[PDB]
Structures are given as C-alpha cells and as structure tokens.
Amino acid sequence: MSKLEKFTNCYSLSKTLRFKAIPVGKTQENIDNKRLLVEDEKRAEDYKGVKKLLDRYYLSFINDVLHSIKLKNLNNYISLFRNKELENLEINLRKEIAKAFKGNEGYKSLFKKDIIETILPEFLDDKDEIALVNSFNGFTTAFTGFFDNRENMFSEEAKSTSIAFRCINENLTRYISNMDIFEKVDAIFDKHEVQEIKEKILNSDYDVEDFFEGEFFNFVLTQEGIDVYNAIIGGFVTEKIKGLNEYINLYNQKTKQKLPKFKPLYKQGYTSDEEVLEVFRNTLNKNSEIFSSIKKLEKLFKNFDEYSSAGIFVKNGPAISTISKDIFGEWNVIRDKWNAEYDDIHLKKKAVVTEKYEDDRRKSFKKIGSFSLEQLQEYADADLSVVEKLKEIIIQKVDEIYKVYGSSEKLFDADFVLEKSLKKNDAVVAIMKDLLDSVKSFENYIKAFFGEGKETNRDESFYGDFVLAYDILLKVDHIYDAIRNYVTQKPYSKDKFKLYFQNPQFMGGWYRATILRYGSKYYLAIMDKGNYEKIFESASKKEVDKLVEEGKLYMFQIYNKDFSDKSHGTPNLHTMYFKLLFDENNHGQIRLSGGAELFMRRASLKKEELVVHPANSPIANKNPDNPKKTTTLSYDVYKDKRFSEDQYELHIPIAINKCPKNIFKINTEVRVLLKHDDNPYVIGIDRGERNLLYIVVVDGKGNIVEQYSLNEIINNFNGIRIKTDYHSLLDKKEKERFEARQNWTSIENIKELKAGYISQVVHKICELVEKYDAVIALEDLNSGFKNSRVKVEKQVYQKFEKMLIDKLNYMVDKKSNPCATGGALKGYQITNKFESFKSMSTQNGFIFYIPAWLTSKIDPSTGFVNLLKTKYTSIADSKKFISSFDRIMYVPEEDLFEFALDYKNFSRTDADYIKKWKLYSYGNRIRIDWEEVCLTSAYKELFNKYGINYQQGDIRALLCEQSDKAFYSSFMALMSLMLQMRNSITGRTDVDFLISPVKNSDGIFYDSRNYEAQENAILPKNADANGAYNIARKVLWAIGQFKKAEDEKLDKVKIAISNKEWLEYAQTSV
Amino acid sequence: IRACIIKEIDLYTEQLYNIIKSLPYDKRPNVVYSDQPLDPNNLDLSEPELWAEQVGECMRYAHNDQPCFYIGSTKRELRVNYIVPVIGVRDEIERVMTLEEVRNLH
Amino acid sequence: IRACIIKEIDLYTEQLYNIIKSLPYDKRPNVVYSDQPLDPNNLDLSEPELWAEQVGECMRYAHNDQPCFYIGSTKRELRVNYIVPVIGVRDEIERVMTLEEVRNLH
RNA sequence: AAUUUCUACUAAGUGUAGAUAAAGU
Ligand SMILES: [Mg+2]
Ligand SMILES: [Mg+2]
C-alpha cells in the first residue's frame, strides 16, 4: 500500500540515446572510395550560404509586403498618445501588420519546399548560387528548424525579436517624440537656409516637413524609408550634407540654450586570435565609435545640472537599490522613505501593520514605473544634492575607465605582436577583460536613467543626447559575449554534420536502415543504392559480411564503453534503455519511435598535440579521500583520446510510455495520498553556508528521521565505497580563481563542476525518495534571498530544480530488476514535465515549493524568532525600546539577565503567536573581524563601567536615565548580538552553531553544540539543518491542511504558508 | 652557448618532471611557467609576465616524449612546457626554490 | 663542444636511471659501463674494453645526488657511473638499444 | 586521466560512480 506504486505509466516521454558508430570490416574504405563524406561536408558548409540567400529573399519579401500596407489606426495612436484605451489599439495595429504579412498571395511558399524548389532558384538568377540553391533539392527537411524560427518575425506576439514589435513599440514612439521635437524646434529655418538643400539633395520631390506629419508614418515601414528619414535627420553624403541634429548643435553653439535634438529610428563566432585582437583594436580604440560615445556621455553627465531635474528619471528595480547604496548610505533608504510616505497616507493611527498590508505595499512599490530626480531629491537631506552625487560618481566611473585606458596603451599600437596563443596568454586577456568589465559596468549603471520610456514630461533636451550616445555603447554587450565565448573555449570541438548517403528519405524509419544484432553486439546496417538477428527473421553472417566486402552494405557497430568486453561495473542509464529496446520484458514501454540520425565529427586535435600518461609509471591520484595514493597501469592513458579521431555519432530517439493507461492528474493524486496517509515522510533540502546542500528527513510528526550533509557524494561499487568531498574541490577552484590573472575560464569550470555536483545530488535525492516514499521540500526561488555566503547560487540551484523535475518525470533504479516496479521498464512518474522557471512554485507532483522566510534564524524547539529591530538610531528610539520591555532584571540564581518582553508593545510583530517571551543572556555569541563574547559578562562589564546597579530588579527605569551617547549604542549593539542565533566565524572555521535565548517548557535553552556531537539526533545540528527542518515542517503543515479538508476541496487548498500561520505552527507544534 | 643553455634548461625540467610526478597534488609548489626555456641560474623577477601558480598533472607528449605540465587544474587547459618553482602567490615573488626544497615537500 | 657533450651524456644517464629504477631485476638490460661519459650517438664497438653485463641496483650518491649503477650483483661492488644498453653477452656486441626499447622490457 | 556527452575520478587495470532529449535558433 505504498504511495509510489501508483505513479507508474502515467504519461508519455521522449529521449534521444546518443551513441558512436564504428565502421565494421572494410566499410570505411568502401566509404572513402565513394566519397560519401565530402558531399555532406560541402552541404554543411553551403548551409550557411543558402541561409544567407534565404535571408536576402526574406528581406525582399518583407520590403515588398511593407510597400503595399497603409494603416487606419495610426492617426488615432498619435492623437491619443501625446492606460488601457491605448494598448488595445496598439495590439490592433500589430494585428493589422501581421495580417498584411500573412495575407499576401505568396506567404504560403515561404516555409515549405516551394521556396527552395522554385522561388529562390528564380529570384536570384546567378549561375553561381543557383548551384547552391539546387544542391539542397530534396533536403528541405534540413531547414525545418530554420523555417520554424524564421517565421516568428512575421508574427505579432510582441516578443523582443519580431518585426511588428520593432516597427510599432520602438519606432512609433520615436516618431511621435520626433513630431513633438519638430513642433518645438522650428522657425530657426528658411528655404534660403539649409532647409531647401536638405529637401533637394535627399528627397527632391516633396517637403521635409512631410516626414513630421502624422499619417506619413506609413512611409518609414520600409528599410529605405528608415534610411531616408535617418538621412534627413543626421546627414547623408550624396558634398557632406549636414543633418538636423547638428543644425541644432549649431544653434545651441551660436547662443547658449540646451534645445532638444531628434531621435533616429531603429533598423529591422570568431576563429583566430588575430581576428579577435583586430576586432578589439577596431571597436574599442581611443578614436572608435564606443570611446566617442563614452566621451559624449562624460560631457553630458558633467553638464548634468543645466537640465531640469524634474525631467530626468531613474527606472525602478535593482537600479534603485544601487542608487540608494551609492547615494543614501546603503541598500534600503529610498525604499523605506517611500514606505514612510505610503504609511502616512494608507495607514491609520493604529499599529495594525499586517503581512497583507506589507505585501500590498510591496506590490504597489514594485509596480511603480520609475522615479524622477526631483522625487529622489525630496527624499534627501539638508545640503545633499542628489544630482551632484550622481554626477561625481559617474565622473569617477569615467575617470576609472580613462585610467584603465592609460594602463592599456600597448594593446592598441600597431607594433604589438602576440607571443602566445590567446587562450594560454592571460596578461592580454586580463587587459581586455578589465577594459570590457569597466565599460560594461558603466553601461549597466547608466542604463538606469532610461526610466521606463513610457511617461509624459521627459526632458528631451537630455534624453536626445543620452540615447544618441547609449545606442552606440550597447554594442559592448555583443563584443563582450563574443570575446568571452572565444576565450572560454575548449581546445577540441564538437562540430559535426549529418550524413544522408545520397538519400533524402534516409533513416527516417524502421529508408535503407536496420538494427542487426549478433551475440552481444548490435549493428546498424545501411543498404546503398554464425547467424545475425534482424530487428526477428535471421540471416547468415557469411553473406552479410560478403555484402560488406562488396559495397552493398555499410555495417556500423553501435558502441559505448558499456558494450566493451572489459567493462564490469554498472552500465549507463541510456545503455540500459538501448539494450531494453530489443528485450523480451519490453512490451511497449520503451519503443523505437521516429528515425535515427547518423552524424560525423572530424578529428579536432592534431596528433602532434596529443598528450599521454606514459605506461608503467606511477600516476598520482587526485582524490585526497582515496586510500590508494598512486596508480601504475600497464598501458597508456591519452588525454581526450575521443577528440583525436573521427567518430560517427548516432542519435536514436526513444518514446517512453507511448500508450499510457494510468492517466490522471498527478497533483491531486499526490494530495489524496498525503491526506489518507497516517505517517508521510518529507525530505527537506536547504542551501547552507558551510554545506552545499543539507538533507533532513522528517516523518509525519516533526521527528527528525535523518539529517546529514551532502558535502560528500558516495559512490558504491563492487562492495567497496569511496567518498568525494565536492566542497573541498569547490574551495580549491575558488582559490585558483583568486590566484589567476583572469577568471573567465575559472567561472565556467566552477559552473560545470557545480552542474556535475547537482547531477550527483539528483541521484542522491532520488534514492532518498524511493527509500522512505517521502515527499521533497524545496525553497521557492521566486521570492526570497540568500545572503551572498551561500555557495550554491540561484542560477545553479534553478538548474538543480530543473534537473530534479526532468529526472522525476521517469525515476529509474539502475541496480533494480528492469521489469520490477521502479526499474527502467516501470519507472515512477511522480512529477509533471518542466515548463518554466516561473511556474516552479507551490507544487510539482511530488515536489512542493516553499518560501524560505523564517527558516534558519528560528529556534526549532520553541519556535522563537527575533522579530525586533535592535539597531541603534538615536537616544529617543533606544530609550523607547528599553522602556517597552515588561521587565528587565538580574536573576541571581542562574546568574543571568532576564528580558521579559511582550511582542504587543513592539512594531511589526504581528506574525507571532505566543506573544510573551522571556529570554535570558545564556551562552556566548560570536559578533562581527570576529570576536567571541560571553553575554552575561559583557552585560555586567557594561553596567559596572557606566555606574549601574542590577541586583535591585526591574532596572528599566534605572537604565533610561543615562545621558551618554555611546552607552545606548553599546547597549543596543550587544542587545542585537544577543538575539543573534546563527553564529559563525568568518574565516572558514567550521563552527556554525545555533543557540537560542529562550528556554522551552522543560527549562533548557536549545544549543546545537549539544546535538552536533551525536548520531541519531532529534533536533537540528546547525543553522542549515534548522533551515531544512523548517522547510520540511512547512510541508508538514500543508499535509495537515490537506488532512483538514475533504476529498473534493483538496485541489483548492492553498499551501503558501503565511508568516502568521508559520509562526503559529512552529510555536504550538511543540 | 645557446645549445648548452637549452640542454641545461631541458635537463632541469626533466628532473623537475620526474620529481613532481610523485608528490600528492596538495603539496605541489607554486611555479613560474612559460614556453621558452627557463633558466633558474639567471632568472630575475620584476618582469611583468611572471605569475606564480600551482602545478597540476604531469604527462608526456605523445609524439616526442617531451614532458609538459598543466598549471592549475587540468580542466583549465593551461598546459605549459617549462616551469620553475618559486615562493610566491602573485606578482610579489620572493625567491626561487631548488631541486631539493621541492623534494622536502613529501 | 665538450660542455654540451657532457650535459647530453648526463641527461641521458639520468633518464636511464629514472627508467631502469622501476624495472624488475630479472628484466634489466645488458649494458656497457665506464666512468667517463658515454655517448651513444658516437659509441663504436670493437674497442677491447667494452664488456656487456647486466645492471643491478640503482642508488644515488649521498654528496651530490649523482646517479650510480651497480653492474651485476650489488655484492660484486662493481659500481659505475655511466652505462649504455646493448644487445650483447660478451665481446660480441650486436647493437645499442634506445630509451624506448628499455621501457618495452616491462 | 580513457567517456555518445558532462562532472568527479583511476575505482583493481583498455576502465569506475552518477546524470544525459537530440536537431535547429
Ligand atoms: Mg558504469
Ligand atoms: Mg574530466
């Protein structure tokens, strides 16, 4: 009556097993004597040519259909633009455009065989490239993806990469702003002046003002229209003709007034160290487009005060936190000023601050588009000008850019020659990375001042110049990505090309392809234009080998290191899948659906570069936790031997559970089974600071069944058992990164090491799940933060959750019998298919996503949590704090200090349930540069040092009489570190205990150091065990909620546990 | 003089390979690496190209059996041909160890 | 020319030491031994002083860490400083093996 | 440090443990 046994054969799934084909007999010279590997390499090299030709034809078709188009909704847009009556109209406009595209009499051919067969061999009419467009005759399928991606531009889904979005959302806005700027900047002009020469030289037929009319936007839809408009804007040689922006500059230089300039419309990997370095020299030299953009932005931001502060803006997001950090002290000052001004309006005279109120305030804030500079000036203080600080910090960033340029004079001079390769040279890559990092930091910083765009009173005098400079600067992103992907590049390469064998319909079924097998060897026989086993009519090995010798057959051998004869351990998972394709216990579970694909990878490493471990010489072992410290092999060990030869890869698709029968909803069945179960286990996972991942398995009543670190992955084999400490490997990699000149390669190495680690943790968690029939408990990554000491960051943790979803779609035990429940043929399907990183929330089959609020700084034996705000601000606030306690006295029996508080008298303490806590000065706390402090002795020291008796009792009144400014500072300091539960020495010393200042019903304070020296412990051993324990107890609360509801209202039960309910549960469960 | 200098540079790096091949990876020294022969008898610091990092694996070239050393991790693919042990962490190099101070490591 | 010749002779004998140190004693080659440096690139037979015997132990001099080889048994106390592997049993020497034909032995 | 491919290896000697949905953009 187990839970998992019902979640097999649920839904369908698909995978591709990749193998390596080995030519058998004289197949390779029979292939080389027909040159069946040069037609296909030529086709793989002509793919890009035909791609460019199809792009050119697409551009011709686009400029054709964009000629026969005139909108009827554009005048309404311009009339209503200069919050919901406009978006319907703009989506109507995009739908009109998309219908004009999809309404032509030729759009049908654009993504089918006709565009290669008839159209493109006619639109071109060049005997050189008609050869190209005729080579791909019958191979239309080779473009299936290209077409399926080259049609998302002719659509209207408004994603960042589409023609409609470009023409409307990014162009019409600039056109309307240009109409405004032309209406404003006029009457400085004459036909005798440069106006008539503009018209004559660039248009020659109609007036120039016609390009600032409203319904003439249905002229800049075509790329040539954009070109002529940007010509009359900026200036277009035929005689260098000046444009409107520099006529404005000429006016603003004649007399001094910052008059706005127009905005131009939009326009709808490297392979050698010398190419990379010359691209660097070209795009980033001291007279390039980018350095000139930097100089222009410098002159602007140093001329930053002659622009009206009410017109500038700053976008709302991470930019606001960074701006507050750089201006208003630290992270959250702007946010708290906005919260103060929001309470002064939407909060009564009462202290009723509720989590729903705080959440609606947070939502209202996060929905604010952007903040002006006058607003951010009101939030400031006396004699602090926000524009001066922004100007000075931007000038500091610019001067740092200039300093790095002055430190990098050498990479620009023509005499420079490369001594070493770029991937092995790290001085020049350090220079390039430092420059790119500084420039991209500046680019990402000044990205804030583009404050949401959609707003009324933008100071166009500033934003003209700003966007003029910034639209050239943001090319550093592509340059950075290209250079980085070039440097972090393996010395080998996995570039391959599919082989067709003069047959468009090749291998697409089970065609001229079959999978033979002989003994324990499986063969792929490809007909051209002993006893085996066909896949079951037999053959004769003699005549099939005769065919192989003749040439009528192309027998490859399917092979991976598990088909070898010297392999004795456990086979790979996909090897087991493949071997099961042809098994008897396999009825229809894993079947051969679709057609295979035979690729071909050429040798990338020259045999002069091959490096080897010489035979009969002791090799050092890299695993510190290995007993055997050396190894002596009787043969050679080549490094990357697989990439030093040609290899025929083979991709075979498989469809698991093609004809399912146990079809139902997985989530509701999980809820029903968790309800009807009397003791459901739960595996809580939490990201620690000293541990990569930490597991705590908790039964259906809150009792810890297991708790251990996932620091070391344990591989079992042959009965032996060897451990690997991935935390030490990660520390070694981080130390190496600290030593290296540049850390482009180190970061990729760390990412791939973490990916491998989570690939091991996936199996760990699966074998934990199929041992207790437990239910997993993961942090909800959408809402929350981890304070920068957690090793596993959010990206790799998101990849870990994705890997767990993709594994739990079909969970297999390799060691188990295949036909047995849990084996490869009957694997558990206890999770739905992955959809997106945003839908990973609140449930996924056997996976519950849980917010990580109040999980690590909470006493796991009493539920206590420090909800106070013990930060020193002034004498009055600390006096009110001290006067808010119900009693503060010295208990002489225990030699402690009791602080009898009451959470009712304190602000923002509504989540709590047992409002009357009594917390002492028990134990020692580690403050932060770290220093250990015994609390009671520190209190006695402070009291005696400032002349204060404490044996009296209720010394609250005796304590709020101190006139000294530093007394209350020290007092609130050690009162803040008294409520510090998670203590840890910074300098990596593994002391991460977790003490609590309150005592439980039995009268003993929880101290983790009493449980770390134990196995089979009932309470968490440290803060991370506490996090996992609480993340499990939240799912236990959700299970209890399921038990409260009926068997039809289960689907609606909300399980997003709120702070009130969570603290209530944690404080009454005991 | 150039022929004898290269011979000395190679005999020294062959001895260094034979020595360093047996130390456990956590004991390997910090070295200064390059592709042109390195001469410890004349090697002078303060050159803006010397960076002290730690040796990794020690393998042999398959075509002419020349020893090569992987600086840092093998997965970093920073394979060099000539190294020299130093007492240093960064551009602040103190001194050059000898063929016996590397044997004392283990 | 004499300095480079001695350097080559010593690098070759150091490699020979590092190789022969690991073979089991029953596989050791037959060699031609002497106390002056031996140059395999020019070594010509028919000299009435070359006797092919089998290497024994391989130890290091305590004062300058120079490799020395015991020809025959260690108990024979025929310790030499420079050897060269040959295919021979007596004054009838056939040819001179190379630094890889000695590695193929085990 | 060998791999269909990835990570950590050498894991008892031409491999070990786990994972792996490919193509195209
Ligand atoms: Mg295996
Ligand atoms: Mg590896």
Among chain B residues, the shortest Cα distance to A428 is held by B49
Measured distance between the N- and C-terminal CA atoms of chain A, rounded to whole angstroms: 30
B22 at interface of A, judged by CB pairs closer than 8 A: yes
Q: Which of residues 520-559 of A touch strand D (CB under 7 A)?
A: 559
Strand partners, A816: none
Structure letter (DSSP) for residue A169? I
Identify nearest nucleotide to residue A638 by CA to C1′ distance.
Answer: D2
Convert A481-497 to b/e letters by CB count within 10 Å (16 or more is b): eebbebbebeebeeeeb
Interface partners of B (3+ CB pairs, < 8 Å)?
A, C
Q: How many CB pairs under 8 A join A and C?
A: 6
Q: Which stretch of DSSP H or E encloses residue A515?
A: strand A514-518
Query: Is the CB atom of residue A716 positioned under 7 angstroms from any atom of strand D?
Result: yes
A630 at interface of C, judged by CB pairs closer than 8 A: no
* CA–centroid distance, residue A575 to ligand 1 (Å): 10
Q: What span, in angstroms and rounded, lies between the C-alpha atoms of A221 and A234?
A: 19
Strand partners, A890: A897
Strand order from edge to edge, sheet including A918-919: A887-891, A896-900, A918-919, A995-999, A1005-1007
CA A746 – C1' D6 distance (Å)? 17
Comparing CA positions, the residue from A290, A318, A301 lying closest to residue A444 is A318
Question: For residue A128, what are its two tokens?
Answer: 């050189």
Instruction: Give the experimental resolution in Å.
Output: 4.9
DSSP character string of A75-121: HHHHHHH---TTHHHHHHHHHHHHHHHTTSTTGGGGGSTHIIIIIHH
Q: Which residues lie below 8 Å from residue A963, measured CB to CB, with a gap of 6+? A: none
Is the separation of the CB atoms in A122 and A106 below 8 Å?
no
Comparing CA positions, the residue from A172, A186, A198 lying closest to residue A81 is A172
Q: Mark yes or no for CB contact A611/B79 under 8 Å.
A: yes
CA C106 – C1' D20 distance (Å)? 40
Q: Which long-range contacts (CB under 8 A, 24 or more apart) does A915-918 make?
A: A916/A886, A917/A864, A917/A998, A918/A998, A918/A999
Write the burial class of residue A1039 (CB in 10 Å: 0-12 exposed, 13-18 middle, 19+ buried): buried
Q: What span, in angstroms and rounded, lies between the C-alpha atoms of A639 and A617?
A: 16
Q: What span, in angstroms and rounded, lies between the C-alpha atoms of A497 and A499?
A: 7
CA A564 – C1' D16 distance (Å)? 14
B78 at interface of A, judged by CB pairs closer than 8 A: yes
User: Chain B closest CA to A713's CA: distance in Å?
Assistant: 20
Cα atoms in the Cβ-side hemisphere of radius 13 Å centred on A437: 11
Q: Which nucleotides of D are covered by protein (CB under 7 A)?
A: 1-25
Q: Which amino acid residue lies closest to nucleotide D23, measuring CA to C1'?
A: A145
Q: Which residues lie below 8 Å from residue A679, measured CB to CB, with a gap of 6+? A: A699, A700, A701
Dihedral sign, CA of C71, C72, C74, C76?
A: negative
Residues of chain C contacting residue A615, judged by C-beta atoms under 8 Å apart = 103
Among chain C residues, the shortest Cα distance to B65 is held by C100
Q: Which amino acid residue lies closest to nucleotide D6, measuring CA to C1'?
A: A756
Alpha carbon B2 to its chain centroid, in Å, reads: 20
CA A372 – C1' D19 distance (Å)? 51
Strands A630-631 and A704-709: unpaired
Looking up tokens 């101190």 gives A962
Residues of chain B contacting residue C65, judged by C-beta atoms under 8 Å apart = 100
CA A826 – C1' D6 distance (Å)? 26
Q: What span, in angstroms and rounded, lies between the C-alpha atoms of A279 and A927?
A: 51
Query: Is the CB atom of residue A665 positioned under 7 angstroms from any atom of strand D?
Result: no
Query: Is the CB atom of residue A155 positioned under 7 angstroms from any atom of strand D?
Result: no
Q: What span, in angstroms and rounded, lies between the C-alpha atoms of C104 and C26?
A: 14
Question: For residue A29, what are its two tokens?
Answer: 């010279």
Query: Is the CB atom of residue A640 positioned under 7 angstroms from any atom of strand D?
Result: yes
Q: Which of residues 759-788 of A touch strand D (CB under 7 A)?
A: 759-760, 762-763, 766
Backbone angles phi, psi at A706, to 5 degrees: -145, 155
Query: Is the CB atom of residue A631 positioned under 7 angstroms from any atom of strand D?
Result: yes
Is the separation of the CB atoms in C54 and C60 below 8 Å?
no
Convert A16-51 to b/e letters by CB count within 10 Å (16 or more is b): ebebbbbbbbebbebbeeeebbeebeebbebbeebe
Residues of chain B contacting residue A639, judged by C-beta atoms under 8 Å apart = 59, 74
Structure method:
cryo-EM
User: Chain B closest CA to A988's CA: distance in Å?
Assistant: 18
Q: What span, in angstroms and rounded, lies between the C-alpha atoms of A830 and A670?
A: 9
Dihedral in degrees, nearest 10, Cα atoms A765, A766, A772, A777: 50
Write the burial class of residue A886 (CB in 10 Å: 0-12 exposed, 13-18 middle, 19+ buried): middle
Looking up tokens 């899948």 gives A577
* CA–centroid distance, residue A759 to ligand 1 (Å): 15
DSSP character string of A855-878: SSSB-TTT--B---------HHHH
Q: Mark yes or no for CB contact B63/A608 under 8 Å.
A: yes
- B29 residue type, one letter: P
- The residue length of chain A stands at 1070
Strand partners, A554: none
Residues of chain B contacting residue A426, judged by C-beta atoms under 8 Å apart = 51, 78
Backbone angles phi, psi at A505, to 5 degrees: -90, 85
Cα atoms in the Cβ-side hemisphere of radius 13 Å centred on A172: 28
CA A725 – C1' D6 distance (Å)? 19
Q: What span, in angstroms and rounded, lies between the C-alpha atoms of A264 and A464?
A: 9
Residues of chain B contacting residue C18, judged by C-beta atoms under 8 Å apart = 18
CA A620 – C1' D10 distance (Å)? 10
Comparing CA positions, the residue from A714, A705, A833 lying closest to residue A774 is A705
Q: What span, in angstroms and rounded, lies between the C-alpha atoms of A882 and A901?
A: 10
Q: Which residues lie below 8 Å from residue A909, measured CB to CB, with a gap of 6+? A: A867, A868, A903, A915
Structure letter (DSSP) for residue A920? -
Is the separation of the CB atoms in C91 and C51 below 8 Å?
yes
Among chain A residues, the shortest Cα distance to B67 is held by A611
Alpha carbon A835 to its chain centroid, in Å, reads: 15
Is the separation of the CB atoms in A427 and A334 below 8 Å?
no
Residues of chain A contacting residue C22, judged by C-beta atoms under 8 Å apart = 616-617
Is the separation of the CB atoms in A932 and A986 below 8 Å?
no
Strand partners, A375: none
Query: Is the CB atom of residue A620 positioned under 7 angstroms from any atom of strand D?
Result: yes
Q: Which stretch of DSSP H or E encloses residue B61?
A: strand B52-61
Q: What span, in angstroms and rounded, lies between the C-alpha atoms of A715 and A1068?
A: 41
